[PDB]
Design a protein around this ligand. Sequence first.
Ligand SMILES: *C[C@@](C)(O)[C@](*)(O)[C@H](Cc1ccccc1)NC(=O)[C@H](Cc1ccc(OC)cc1)NC(=O)[C@H](C)NC(=O)CN1CCOCC1
Ligand SMILES: *C[C@@](C)(O)[C@](*)(O)[C@H](Cc1ccccc1)NC(=O)[C@H](Cc1ccc(OC)cc1)NC(=O)[C@H](C)NC(=O)CN1CCOCC1
Ligand SMILES: *C[C@@](C)(O)[C@](*)(O)[C@H](Cc1ccccc1)NC(=O)[C@H](Cc1ccc(OC)cc1)NC(=O)[C@H](C)NC(=O)CN1CCOCC1
Ligand SMILES: *C[C@@](C)(O)[C@](*)(O)[C@H](Cc1ccccc1)NC(=O)[C@H](Cc1ccc(OC)cc1)NC(=O)[C@H](C)NC(=O)CN1CCOCC1
Ligand SMILES: [Mg+2]
Ligand SMILES: [Mg+2]
Ligand SMILES: [Mg+2]
Ligand SMILES: [Mg+2]
Ligand SMILES: [Mg+2]
Lengths: 196, 196, 222, 219, 224, 204, 195, 195, 212
Amino acid sequence: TSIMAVTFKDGVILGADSRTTTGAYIANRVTDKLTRVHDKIWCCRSGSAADTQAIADIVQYHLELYTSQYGTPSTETAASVFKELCYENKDNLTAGIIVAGYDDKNKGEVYTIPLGGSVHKLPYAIAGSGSTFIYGYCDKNFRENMSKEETVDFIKHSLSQAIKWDGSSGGVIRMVVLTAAGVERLIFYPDEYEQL
Amino acid sequence: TSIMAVTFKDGVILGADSRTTTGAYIANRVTDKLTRVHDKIWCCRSGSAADTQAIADIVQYHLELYTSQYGTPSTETAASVFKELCYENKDNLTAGIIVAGYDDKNKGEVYTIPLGGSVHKLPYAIAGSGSTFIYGYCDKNFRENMSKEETVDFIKHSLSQAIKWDGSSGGVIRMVVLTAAGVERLIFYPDEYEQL
Amino acid sequence: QFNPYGDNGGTILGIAGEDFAVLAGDTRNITDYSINSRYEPKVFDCGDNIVMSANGFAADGDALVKRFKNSVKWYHFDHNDKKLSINSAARNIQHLLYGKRFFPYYVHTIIAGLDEDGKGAVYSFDPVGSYEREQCRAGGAAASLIMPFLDNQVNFKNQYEPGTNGKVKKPLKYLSVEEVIKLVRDSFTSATERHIQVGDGLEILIVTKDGVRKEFYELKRD
Amino acid sequence: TTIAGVVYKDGIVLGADTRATEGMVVADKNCSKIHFISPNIYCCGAGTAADTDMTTQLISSNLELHSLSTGRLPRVVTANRMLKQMLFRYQGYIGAALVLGGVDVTGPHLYSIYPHGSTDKLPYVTMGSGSLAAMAVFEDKFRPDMEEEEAKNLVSEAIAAGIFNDLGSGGNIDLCVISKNKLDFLRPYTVPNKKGTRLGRYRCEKGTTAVLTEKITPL
Amino acid sequence: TQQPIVTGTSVISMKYDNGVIIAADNLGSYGSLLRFNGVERLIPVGDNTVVGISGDISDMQHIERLLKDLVTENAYDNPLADAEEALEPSYIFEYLATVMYQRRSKMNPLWNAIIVAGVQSNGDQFLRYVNLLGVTYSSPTLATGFGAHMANPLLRKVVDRESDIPKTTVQVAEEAIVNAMRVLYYRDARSSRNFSLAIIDKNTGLTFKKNLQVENMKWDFAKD
Amino acid sequence: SDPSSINGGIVVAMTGKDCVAIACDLRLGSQSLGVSNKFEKIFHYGHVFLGITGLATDVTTLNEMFRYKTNLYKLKEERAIEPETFTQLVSSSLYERRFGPYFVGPVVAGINSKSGKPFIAGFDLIGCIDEAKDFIVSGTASDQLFGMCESLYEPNLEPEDLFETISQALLNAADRDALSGWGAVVYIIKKDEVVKRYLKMRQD
Amino acid sequence: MDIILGIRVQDSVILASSKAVTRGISVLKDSDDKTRQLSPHTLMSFAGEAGDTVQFAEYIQANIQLYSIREDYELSPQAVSSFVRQELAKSIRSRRPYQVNVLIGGYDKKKNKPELYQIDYLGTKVELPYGAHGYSGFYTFSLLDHHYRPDMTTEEGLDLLKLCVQELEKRMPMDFKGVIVKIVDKDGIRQVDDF
Amino acid sequence: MDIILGIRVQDSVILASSKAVTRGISVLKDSDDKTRQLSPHTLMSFAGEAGDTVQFAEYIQANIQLYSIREDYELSPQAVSSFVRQELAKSIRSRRPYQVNVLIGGYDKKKNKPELYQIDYLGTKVELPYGAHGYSGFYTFSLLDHHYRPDMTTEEGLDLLKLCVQELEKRMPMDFKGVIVKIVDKDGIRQVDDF
Amino acid sequence: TTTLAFRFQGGIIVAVDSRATAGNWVASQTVKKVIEINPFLLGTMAGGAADCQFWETWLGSQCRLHELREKERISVAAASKILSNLVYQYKGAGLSMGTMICGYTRKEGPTIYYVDSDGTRLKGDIFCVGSGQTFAYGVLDSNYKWDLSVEDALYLGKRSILAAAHRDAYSGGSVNLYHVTEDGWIYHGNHDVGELFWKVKEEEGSFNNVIG
Ligand SMILES: *C[C@@](C)(O)[C@](*)(O)[C@H](Cc1ccccc1)NC(=O)[C@H](Cc1ccc(OC)cc1)NC(=O)[C@H](C)NC(=O)CN1CCOCC1
Ligand SMILES: *C[C@@](C)(O)[C@](*)(O)[C@H](Cc1ccccc1)NC(=O)[C@H](Cc1ccc(OC)cc1)NC(=O)[C@H](C)NC(=O)CN1CCOCC1
Ligand SMILES: *C[C@@](C)(O)[C@](*)(O)[C@H](Cc1ccccc1)NC(=O)[C@H](Cc1ccc(OC)cc1)NC(=O)[C@H](C)NC(=O)CN1CCOCC1
Ligand SMILES: *C[C@@](C)(O)[C@](*)(O)[C@H](Cc1ccccc1)NC(=O)[C@H](Cc1ccc(OC)cc1)NC(=O)[C@H](C)NC(=O)CN1CCOCC1
Ligand SMILES: [Mg+2]
Ligand SMILES: [Mg+2]
Ligand SMILES: [Mg+2]
Ligand SMILES: [Mg+2]
Ligand SMILES: [Mg+2]
């Protein structure tokens, strides 16, 4: 899987490939790995598909119940609920989740939750099997307070490389843009990103 | 280990980090992983230190005896001798070797020999544990027929990233330049490359 | 770890008549749940009026058949073009198989032909070369489905005469070549219906004093 | 097993073969694999056969009770959730691999559910030993918004690919067409193999078997 | 005993009325890493045979050298090396089949699956498979590894039995092969877009096509 | 070690014209040692017949269990259980031990008393229903029985024609299995009479 | 525990059970009675794992004796055997199963018939004319197949049993230190003190 | 093979060796002589793995008999035992070692002394007043520690040996079918036919 | 398998069953477990079918070379020891072989040697080898005496295999009988257990554990 979340001036953007594998067989080539846990809190999923879906469904439930009682939860609160599930059930789970959200107060925020169940707040984050190949590229090319078009290009180029080298990643590049303006879904096909 | 060989206009340049590990202990922090098998045929060594030294010594012997009888061997010939040893003794060896040399006829050439014992002639090559992190970066930034100063920078930036992310790599960045002009040894210290 | 053996499926059937013999086999070749070929012959004319099949692991089967064919060739050279009798061929095959006792040929072998009195013969071998002459033998994947039917219909087992109630056995009347071919085709139709590795085609080699004849029939392809 | 489904213009077409096996032996040649969940939702089933039967039946039963309480037709998402959450809880030990298809108030929906509790929501899916053979046919010939008779043919063609090329699959082709206006449960849709004809009669004549004793009791 | 390191995926093939077609992608995988993007896995032998190889790439390169060396050796003291005593597909196959089975029997196999495609002296189509165990078989369509599961079902719809071979033209057969290569790219996680294709025809000879690509790719249904 | 082949034995059932037949061998062993040659595997609950192969302690336990359940059924329903209903009861009961199963291969046989329709069925050890019209087989010589039944069987046989078919299927299949035989029983079941016959077979 | 035999004749059931109790390399005792009286006309012999054998026998004995007091009635041998089988069949799926095999020899006072039941640690019950557990059966069943008749007297049963014990002394590797023999008939249970 | 004993008295060595040959669950023979005469005044008893035992004994016998012909002379018991030990010590580091334990009882005609050597399959040699191999020694050594005296007669040696065999029959689990006894003295080797 | 051979007043009796198994699969019921080495030597076969058939056929070749080289019939002692010394060379390799070398010569009289694949070689008067040896031992040992006639000995051997054919799941098919005397061996027929069992039951009044 190749997934990433990147903060920028107007907010945050999540990105992902669309490949799901069973050994060498691509079980779903058009997978949607960007899932919505609240209006403007989304996550990227890597690891066991069953585990990450089960977690994401429970988080969605917790935040819906939080909203009923205490209003809109912060991105930090969403990350804490993901962490709590992942840490306490570390022996039975294989889940690597990036949490990304837009507040008006805090603006864009990215939290990564690797296998251990630890939490790390970062300007951007990369994860999944295909992320190994783009550490070098992403570190050299990331800047803070990029524009929307720059951040879309930074994610598109990065995942293009992750897809190129990782057999476990592939298909379309999906993105989800989180700003004050709302929620925008973007898709990019092989014919576009392969020629970069 | 992080190693690479890159062809350019005037010839070829080999590059390497200097770290040698025994588990977490850095047994040699100033290691020389670029070894000379002929006047203008060198190799980069990754894998078992004992295996790669034993191989490099045998190749050096074969090419010295080739030279005594048939004059200067081609870079292709050197690669074939490395391949022959690595392929036929694949069950007992852990060696990943890049072979790089300068002919006047052929100019710069790079051959990579991964674990299997297969041979692959390439414009440039990367290898070692730290190479995983720079596939994305190297693919995006490599051009053919670069100048010497561009290729030194391309190798310096690449291995700087490989060192940054891989714990198994580190120390100084050594390089060896192979052109018609001769053989030049370059070294770059942490204080120089870390701030890139 | 490397596993030198594999299973290519298939099923074979030998039946000895009074003055003839048949050796049949399905033409499907498989590995696991995949079909490799719908027509890969398995039963071979080896010369000297002997037909052979080595069903199981197809590589070991091909190797063995190849070695026996060569054994027939060198028997002619070394013994003044003498015809290799079916009993002698069988003993030669025992030694070929037992030669690899500690790294076996993963196959169940059957040869068919005529004995030196002109009567029909079928010999049957385990993987390490133990053998015996029989009148009837199925081998391979669906052998457990076919052999009981052949005990019942060829040797008239558990069959008695109506009216006597268990006292007088049904007499052991001889089967014609047309009668035997019906049993083979129906045995393979049954085995195809109930065994997943059996199907595609049936190839029968018939041995008489006049020589080796072939017949081919379609089998269900799923 | 070869099970498959497609989303077409008016709704859903589900497909399945009819071979049940034990070991390498065929126990049933005409075995039904398309299960009833609710009147507007059906489920094709592959994997461990008992697990497939009981898992569909339990979720069908619970949806019936759910639907009686709410008074409205159930949705595919709730069938999907109930199956998913159960299979996840049991960590793969309930070896059910389903193709879930139905038509809601919200339109037609098709899912694939895996033994570990993962689900994919897709316009076409295939599962079982014969899923690759069947998926090859869909990658070759599928397009979105097909007409009914075209979609029927594509699914039938995909199951056939499994029947012939996969040894795990065989027998007849069953379809289930689901739209807003109708439900068409076609069993069998096609009989691609004739039953082999036997050339002899091997049945024994009366008094051929040897008996020791006999008893008769009326009812 | 070893384990394969750098690997090649599916080789697919079929017969048609006048000859045979064979194809294979240009990738050398290193586990999940798509390491080498310029690897040729169809290796021609003379002007009447193409050997398509999947599995371990170092063992492929070894086999490539054996075949190269076989051509050299057949030329020795052979005035008819480019005519009646040229190497045949059936000769080249039987050699490889002998080698493969010998190596498995010494518990040191060549970790490959091979398809030999060609046309014989008398115009007959030759198409046969051999693998690391020495197992051999022939069929109107043949495919290794992943292609056995996805390519064969599609190719068999064009040539289901022997009697369909004369009815199949080179255009129909080539379309089917290229169609199958697209399907494998969608669905095989260890495949690539770039491939090579080879036609060996009894009239037009050996045509070797490099740098082909999978095209007409349906991804539009993803956005929903 | 393998619980399904410690004790050994077989059951087969067939349909005919207005009749069904079910049959079983009489062996009980401890692997190679033959112990009993009077261990019947066919039981009945009213007009519904149940054959059970596999681990003998479970064969006995399940018989006792289904007697229990069908007795309470009859008391509450005020009628005997039918084959279709009993089949579902067997399936339920086996599946409730999904992760610690009874090591058995049950076979239902009977005639529905209301419709008059002949009925047979079979199950795996966790209760999946094989629901075939022609024949059902079970035991250590199941492969052998499958082959015999597929070549001998034909539809709509009269009771005494069917007797010969099922008997020859059982006997010839058992004689190719080390852990089956030692005697055999055949029930011919009609809508209102049942004929039970013991077969003469080789005692090795 | 090693050898336990049983044989049902015309009017009685005879149980023979070895006297040796071995642990490792030492024979700790050569006079061990591997039986318990469950009721006046029902006797159970037993063999299997150390501890489990006696613990199981005494537990069954206690329950049948409780039944006898409560109802002022002796359960039939058929009933006792069915109770024992259920206990073993319950046991086999426990945390720690009873590793005990048993023979139940009883005289049914209602039917005026001797009855012999063989039950293993799995709960596998069979009524037999003669039975054995463990390796003994491999020798003794073929003898009894040859020599047994249903209408034999108790003395003929004891002679046939001597022939079984001689064959076991000749051909078995372990010294089982002879057998204690007990007869179960209409008059109850008695021990043959010279064998 | 199971029990082999040896005891050296005043003027002789006495070797007792069991008669049973068991394979699995069946005692195949009850009259097996587990000894070979190496020379007229030297006897070797043996026990260990099937096949290896006899093969080793007969091989040693052949070599000593060859020495006897070549030199027209009988090797001392000390010499024969040293030859045997070396063969076993060579064996233990082979591809497939001989799994055989031995006792060598001899009368040295030069020194006019009986001698008993105990050697195991590793090549561990010891001269002893009394010896045993396998489990027998666990019972028999404590007896002999109590009752043995160096100046005993051959009849006293045989009584002391009966007391060893009775204790083994009482306390060992396996029926070894009694022992064949042989005396090695100045007049050669003879078998005690009633024991 | 069940093979027995025993010595008595009027020679040697040898009897064997005729079943071959591959697990619980009955592979054949018409198998020859007695090899006729010459007119005075028999070999029985138990264990691996190939191992027996091969090395006992080979034994017959080595017995022929002895009588060519030495102008004299090979002794039973010598014939048995060729086979025992052979299997001992293959010890640990996994040969499975349990056999009985039965024969007559003037030098030794009637003689039986037990030889097995782990090197054991034993002379004796009675042996039973196979999966069904215990069942045969039971009947044989309890009806044996030197006294026996040739008619009674032949029957007792026939009956001791029947006994094991019945109880042992891996023995059966038919009983092949041999009588060895000073003049050589004599075949005494193939007796199918299918018919023999019911005949022996009726005539002897035994096997009362059975329904029939
Ligand atoms: C790089 C990639 C594509 O693997 C990325 O990490 C995927 C993330 C993803 C996929 C779909 C939806 C959301 C997120 N992961 C997968 O594709 C996983 C790979 C995976 C499997 C198993 C484990 O650890 C136990 C980790 C990662 N694919 C699956 O989960 C598929 C659907 N199911 C299986 O492979 C079945 N296996 C059987 C063995 O037991 C585990 C599940
Ligand atoms: C990334 C790095 C630094 O590991 C790179 O690949 C090194 C290449 C190198 C180092 C020195 C000179 C030339 C080239 N490799 C090492 O530092 C190796 C790591 C390694 C060890 C073992 C194996 O495979 C068996 C592969 C890689 N370090 C060593 O070889 C050191 C000197 N020795 C040991 O770690 C001792 N071990 C003990 C266990 O048996 C293997 C050797
Ligand atoms: C291609 C095929 C035939 O496998 C397809 O998936 C079948 C789907 C099906 C659905 C409903 C009714 C009938 C058939 N599945 C089967 O036929 C399964 C195949 C199978 C066997 C074994 C295992 O083990 C994990 C999985 C799948 N057949 C069965 O389930 C049969 C009836 N029962 C058994 O094989 C008994 N085993 C015992 C061990 O536990 C699993 C059940
Ligand atoms: C009662 C029985 C069956 O045990 C008796 O001993 C048979 C004696 C016999 C003698 C001559 C000809 C035929 C039969 N033995 C068999 O039938 C053997 C039993 C057996 C199988 C396997 C082994 O393995 C060490 C030992 C004994 N059956 C066979 O030999 C069968 C027909 N063949 C195989 O099992 C083939 N395998 C292949 C691998 O190598 C071992 C033999
Ligand atoms: Mg990719
Ligand atoms: Mg089929
Ligand atoms: Mg069903
Ligand atoms: Mg039988
Ligand atoms: Mg038997």
